[PDB]
Amino acid sequence: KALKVRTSASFRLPKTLKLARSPKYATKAVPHYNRLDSYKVIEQPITSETAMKKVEDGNTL
Amino acid sequence: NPLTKSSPRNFGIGQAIQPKRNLSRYVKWPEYVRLQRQKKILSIRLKVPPSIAQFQNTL
Amino acid sequence: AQRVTFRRRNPYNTKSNKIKVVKTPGGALRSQHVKKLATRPKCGDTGVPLQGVSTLRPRQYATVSRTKKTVSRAYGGSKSANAVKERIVRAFLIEEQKIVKRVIKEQTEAAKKAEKKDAKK
Amino acid sequence: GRVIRNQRKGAGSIFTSHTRLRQGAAKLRNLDYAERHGYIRGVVKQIVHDAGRGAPLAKVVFRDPYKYKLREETFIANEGLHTGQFIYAGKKASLNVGNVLPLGSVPEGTIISNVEERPGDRGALARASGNYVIVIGHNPEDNKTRVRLPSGAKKIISSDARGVIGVVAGGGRIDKPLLKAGRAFHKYRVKRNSWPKTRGVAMNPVDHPHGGGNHQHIGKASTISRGAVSGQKAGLIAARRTGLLRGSQ
Amino acid sequence: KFLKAGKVAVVVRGRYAGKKVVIVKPHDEGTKSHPFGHALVAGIERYPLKVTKRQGAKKVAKRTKIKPFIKVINYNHLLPTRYTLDVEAFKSVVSTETFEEPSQREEAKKVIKKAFEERHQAGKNQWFFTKLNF
Amino acid sequence: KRTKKVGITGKYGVRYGSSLRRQVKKLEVQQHATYNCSFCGKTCVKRGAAGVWSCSSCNRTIAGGAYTLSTAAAATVRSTIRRLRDM
Amino acid sequence: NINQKLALVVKSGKYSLGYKSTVKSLRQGKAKLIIIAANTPVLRKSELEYYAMLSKTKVYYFQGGNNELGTAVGKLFRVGVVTILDAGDSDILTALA
Numbered sequence: 001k002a003l004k005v006r007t008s009a010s011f012r013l014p015k016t017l018k019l020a021r022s023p024k025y026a027t028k029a030v031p032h033y034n035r036l037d038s039y040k041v042i043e044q045p046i047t048s049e050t051a052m053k054k055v056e057d058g059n060t061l
Numbered sequence: 062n063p064l065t066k067s068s069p070r071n072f073g074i075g076q077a078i079q080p081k082r083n084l085s086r087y088v089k090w091p092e093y094v095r096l097q098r099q100k101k102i103l104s105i106r107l108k109v110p111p112s113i114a115q116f117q118n119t120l
Numbered sequence: 121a122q123r124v125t126f127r128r129r130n131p132y133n134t135k136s137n138k139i140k141v142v143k144t145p146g147g148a149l150r151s152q153h154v155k156k157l158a159t160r161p162k163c164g165d166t167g168v169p170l171q172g173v174s175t176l177r178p179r180q181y182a183t184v185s186r187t188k189k190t191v192s193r194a195y196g197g198s199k200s201a202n203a204v205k206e207r208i209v210r211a212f213l214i215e216e217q218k219i220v221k222r223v224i225k226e227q228t229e230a231a232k233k234a235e236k237k238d239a240k241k
Numbered sequence: 242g243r244v245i246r247n248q249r250k251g252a253g254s255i256f257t258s259h260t261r262l263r264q265g266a267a268k269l270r271n272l273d274y275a276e277r278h279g280y281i282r283g284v285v286k287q288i289v290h291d292a293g294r295g296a297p298l299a300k301v302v303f304r305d306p307y308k309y310k311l312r313e314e315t316f317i318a319n320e321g322l323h324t325g326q327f328i329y330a331g332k333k334a335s336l337n338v339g340n341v342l343p344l345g346s347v348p349e350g351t352i353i354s355n356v357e358e359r360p361g362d363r364g365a366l367a368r369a370s371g372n373y374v375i376v377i378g379h380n381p382e383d384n385k386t387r388v389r390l391p392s393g394a395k396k397i398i399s400s401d402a403r404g405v406i407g408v409v410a411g412g413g414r415i416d417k418p419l420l421k422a423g424r425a426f427h428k429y430r431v432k433r434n435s436w437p438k439t440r441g442v443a444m445n446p447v448d449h450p451h452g453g454g455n456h457q458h459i460g461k462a463s464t465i466s467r468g469a470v471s472g473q474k475a476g477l478i479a480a481r482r483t484g485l486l487r488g489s490q
Numbered sequence: 491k492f493l494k495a496g497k498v499a500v501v502v503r504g505r506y507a508g509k510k511v512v513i514v515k516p517h518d519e520g521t522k523s524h525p526f527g528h529a530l531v532a533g534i535e536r537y538p539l540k541v542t543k544r545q546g547a548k549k550v551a552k553r554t555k556i557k558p559f560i561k562v563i564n565y566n567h568l569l570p571t572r573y574t575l576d577v578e579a580f581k582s583v584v585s586t587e588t589f590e591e592p593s594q595r596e597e598a599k600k601v602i603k604k605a606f607e608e609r610h611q612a613g614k615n616q617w618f619f620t621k622l623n624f
Numbered sequence: 625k626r627t628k629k630v631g632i633t634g635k636y637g638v639r640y641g642s643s644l645r646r647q648v649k650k651l652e653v654q655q656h657a658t659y660n661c662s663f664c665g666k667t668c669v670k671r672g673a674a675g676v677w678s679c680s681s682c683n684r685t686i687a688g689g690a691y692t693l694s695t696a697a698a699a700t701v702r703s704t705i706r707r708l709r710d711m
Numbered sequence: 712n713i714n715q716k717l718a719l720v721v722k723s724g725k726y727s728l729g730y731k732s733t734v735k736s737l738r739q740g741k742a743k744l745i746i747i748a749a750n751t752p753v754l755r756k757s758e759l760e761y762y763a764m765l766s767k768t769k770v771y772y773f774q775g776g777n778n779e780l781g782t783a784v785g786k787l788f789r790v791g792v793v794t795i796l797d798a799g800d801s802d803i804l805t806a807l808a
Contacts, residue, residue: 063613064538073279079307194505204507205502207624208624209502209754211623212500213757216572290672296674296687297687318676320695325684336709337709348708352705370674371695407701407705408695408701410675410676410689411689411690412695414689416647421639492740493738527738570738665776
């Protein structure tokens with residue numbers, strides 16, 4: 001007894017212990033290898049003659 | 062004692078922001094609280110019948 | 121003679137698409153985009169344009185020194201000088217009256233209690 | 242036939258009002274403690290023309306008695322309020338043009354506006370330009386004043402109903418004729434979409450009861466039953482009299 | 491009458507605008523440098539910050555600190571006051587020569603600060619040491 | 625004197641007809657004219673959107689009638705309250 | 712009445728018009744009586760009225776605004792507040808008004 005004197009007439013939802021995930025098995029099972037590798041990002045270089053201008057003269061492959 | 066300045070606060074409607082009194086009475090309770098209170102009342106305000114009644118009058 | 125085009129893929133003559141034709145040091149005329157002229161900051165109490173405060177679009181001064189945002193008084197880049205003066209005066213002169221009323225009501229209540237005691241006798 | 246010009250209005254697609262320019266919900270303060278016992282000083286910061294309004298508004302600023310904050314409230318300005326006036330609202334405030342008592346505190350004879358029908362309505366009666374309620378009576382046994390409304394219709398109100406003392410601003414607007422359609426245009430263009438009204442009579446009998454015929458005429462009593470029907474009700478609805486009205490209202 | 495040595499005016503225009511002051515040496519007129527009715531006024535810049543019991547030291551020492559300033563202030567910029575607050579003691583400290591030279595300006599501010607810290611302790615002339623709210 | 629009697633309403637030319645010109649003239653005089661400012665003392669201008677006056681050289685603002693600073697109703701109601709305040 | 716008496720000042724008598732000069736002369740103490748208009752704003756009314764009490768001066772409230780005080784002091788322009796520094800011929804100093 002001697003109850004909780006409150007000030008806010010507004011009764012908000014009382015902050016509580018939001019527990020985190022501790023799942024009994026991995027959903028994915030095997031972590032997937034990198035979607036987008038080094039080699040998989042950059043495919044072919046270019047041979048359009050006006051790129052080979054830009055390579056040699058501008059220093060941009 | 063000297064530098065400590067007496068200064069009344071004064072809560073006469075249009076003077077000085079009213080201080081945090083207990084507003085327990087005036088809370089917007091959640092629906093379930095509102096039910097289980099008002100269910101109690103509603104029982105009692107009703108003329109209840111005797112075949113219940115006797116469970117109020119307990120040991 | 122030397123005509124000119126916008127720069128931006130907004131054809132339209134909107135505010136925030138205002139061209140100023142400019143001779144470039146190529147020599148050809150080129151358009152350039154006149155960014156909106158900021159209106160001057162203003163007083164809180166009055167409609168006064170508030171003095172000593174750089175104009176600048178709300179951001180253009182968000183990264184400018186606060187001397188240029190402000191003046192050095194009481195209510196700097198807010199209330200205006202005589203606006204403040206009005207409300208120092210008014211603050212101070214009122215506080216005296218509130219002191220004066222207290223003395224009146226203190227002494228008149230002391231007289232009231234004396235009048236009732238004499239009436240009760 | 243069709244649905245009429247004046248059955249759709251309800252649907253509310255176009256015949257919704259226009260609330261771009263429209264400033265704020267013209268309303269009194271919310272009631273209690275402060276202003277059901279003593280009173281509070283407002284401050285009129287702005288008087289401001291409202292688009293699509295019978296009479297201009299007043300951002301009257303008060304103080305929250307429970308937080309360090311100001312609330313600004315759009316009262317309907319009564320001829321008299323002026324920026325930097327001190328409005329005073331609630332039981333113990335006095336009879337002055339802009340103060341806001343509750344009909345109870347207000348002697349018979351007084352002239353009031355934004356009178357709350359029920360108390361806590363934040364204003365209802367006598368809010369358009371120039372209009373005002375007159376507090377006729379007082380029934381302190383069962384606290385309820387009799388009050389005259391601009392119509393005339395005298396009506397019993399709760400004595401705890403409020404209302405801003407004075408007559409409302411924009412008084413005698415309708416003095417002027419508009420001339421020129423265009424000014425009627427801009428009147429309604431800023432409110433709603435009723436303007437121009439075509440006359441049923443002119444329209445086809447598809448589109449409106451009066452419509453059609455080889456002469457523009459109605460042909461069956463423009464008076465209509467009160468217990469009529471959506472689409473029947475175009476003409477003089479539920480009339481008592483009709484025709485050129487002589488004398489008092 | 492009036493505007494004598496004590497007179498607790500309140501500066502109205504210019505920086506100290508809204509800060510309470512004492513007219514330490516008035517001049518009706520006549521100076522070549524300040525051609526108008528002006529005072530020399532010492533007065534407080536930062537206030538005493540409102541101490542209490544239930545408080546102390548690294549706040550109270552902190553609170554009880556009082557900056558002062560000194561200024562030649564035209565009488566059109568001082569709203570003078572009932573409240574007087576005494577003393578001849580600053581007059582000799584606050585001369586016209588005291589103004590101009592930056593070191594000498596400080597010398598006064600160093601004395602006057604002490605004088606206000608003297609006064610503010612033992613609650614002498616309380617009004618002058620509360621902030622003018624505006 | 626330009627106009628024998630259209631006065632201000634001569635903007636409207638030959639439209640709307642002598643009655644609806646007259647009616648408006650009376651109120652377009654009233655509304656376009658300058659009050660005297662209760663507080664300032666001064667007298668120029670100013671109406672600005674119906675029932676909202678003014679500023680002269682001051683800036684306040686005052687709820688008045690549509691076409692005049694004080695409708696007669698306001699003045700009589702000022703009295704009505706002047707009388708009923710005193711009770 | 713007052714209007715006759717301020718006329719008696721303005722012809723043969725020394726008097727100041729307006730605020731700054733009033734105040735200048737409240738601070739000099741030359742002001743024996745200041746006549747404040749009504750419409751003159753309560754702030755500046757209360758400011759004068761303060762200075763007055765430090766100078767122990769009379770403050771007569773000219774019932775009526777500032778266009779009609781200028782009138783009353785034989786002026787065209789409106790005057791918000793008059794001082795009466797010296798006007799021994801007149802009777803406003805002797806009068807409570």
